[PDB]
Structure 1
Amino acid sequence: GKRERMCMKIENDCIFEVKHEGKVTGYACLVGDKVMKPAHVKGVIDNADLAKLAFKKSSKYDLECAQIPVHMRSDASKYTHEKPEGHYNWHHGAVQYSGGRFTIPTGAGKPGDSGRPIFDNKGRVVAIVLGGANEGSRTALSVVTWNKDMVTRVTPEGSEEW
């Protein structure tokens, strides 16, 4: 309903494309005062001045971060770090967080959808999805969090890169 409408409205302005060979590969996010972009996929960002700037890449954390141009500050995304257990919003159906794990019912994700931000009950971002591992009728999501000041990767066994 209206929650999906507002999610689409914010997504039409925050997430950016990554383009390669006539095919979209990845999604970049504008979180707080930095730009996240998972480093595993490679392509040209579908933007003029976003791709003109200089990035900082880490392969250990499989990501790359950038500083906002001063003329896109207002298009923020209201980062946060509180993670109560329960239900969370996502562009492809609600995720369930329990036992320090992120779960999605069976294959609600497509292969190549790495980079979708997850929003909380108030619309604030919590984690960026990286990969998935399917067991039974569910799939555990390998994502990164922003607990305090360090970024922590959680990855289950047999996770396939998206």
Structure 2
Amino acid sequence: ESDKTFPIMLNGQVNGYACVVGGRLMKPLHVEGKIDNEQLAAVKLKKASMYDLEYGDVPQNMKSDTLQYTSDKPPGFYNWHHGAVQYENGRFTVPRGVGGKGDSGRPILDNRGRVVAIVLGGANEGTRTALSVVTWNQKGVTIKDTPEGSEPW
């Protein structure tokens, strides 16, 4: 997570994180800023606005060292920068008070060091905080899970 996750800056303040997954760079659209890495500054970022994202093709050198996505999602606990995130009923949550603005784009890590989702926003719900994110699927289908009251971080 530390090596292959680059913050996006704006006026000296971090407002998101960009992720290189499966040989391609991805960044979320709701955040505006400057990508940290110089080599990836030259990638023309094709935008999926309804997916609230832009994606680009990383150069030759860095396509070998990237994070790996996953399709199988055994329900339970998954790794993340701010601890363990909980998955049941096709839904991701975290203990309340964990996470906030500027954490968008941080991948969710699993046991074998692979990505299972990308955090986009969260809704504080008292007992927990429900994470509005994007996830994969068995048939290679990317699906949003944005619960009610979701706020783009």
**How many residues are treated as equivalent by the alignment?**
152
Alignment partner for residue 16 of structure 2, among 10, 26, 29?
Answer: 26
Look up the equivalent residue of 1:121 and give its one-letter code. N
| 1:118 counterpart letter in structure 2 | I
Instruction: Name 1:100's counterpart in structure 2.
Output: 90
Q: Is the 8 A contact 2:24 2:63 kept in 1?
A: no
Q: Would you identify which runs of 4 or more consecutive aligned residues in structure 1 move more than 4 Å?
A: none
Paired position in structure 2 for 1:14: 4
Secondary structure of residue in 2 paired with 1:29 = strand
- For residues 4-52 of structure 1, the C-alpha deviation after alignment (integer angstroms, 9 at most, x for no partner) is xxxxxxx232101211111111100010121111111111111112011
Cα distance, 1:110 vs structure 2: 2.3
CA–CA separation in structure 2 for the residues paired with 1:78 and 1:71: 17
State the Cα RMSD in Å. 1.1
Name the amino acid aligned to 1:155.
T
Is 2:82–2:99's contact at 8 Å kept on the other side of the alignment? Answer: yes
The alignment-based identity, stated in percent, is 63
Q: Identify which of 128, 131, 142 aligns with 2:121.
A: 131
Q: SS at the partner of 1:51? A: helix
TM-score calculated relative to the size of structure 1: 0.90
1:69-116 CA distances to partner (integer Å, 9 max, x unpaired)? 001022111221110100110100100000001010111112221111
Tell me the TM-score normalized by structure 2: 0.95
Q: Which residue of 2 aligns with 1:153?
A: 144
Tell me which protein shows more strand as a share of its residues. 2
Bigger relative CO (Cα 8 Å, ≥ 6 apart): 2
SS of alignment partner, residue 94 of structure 1:
strand
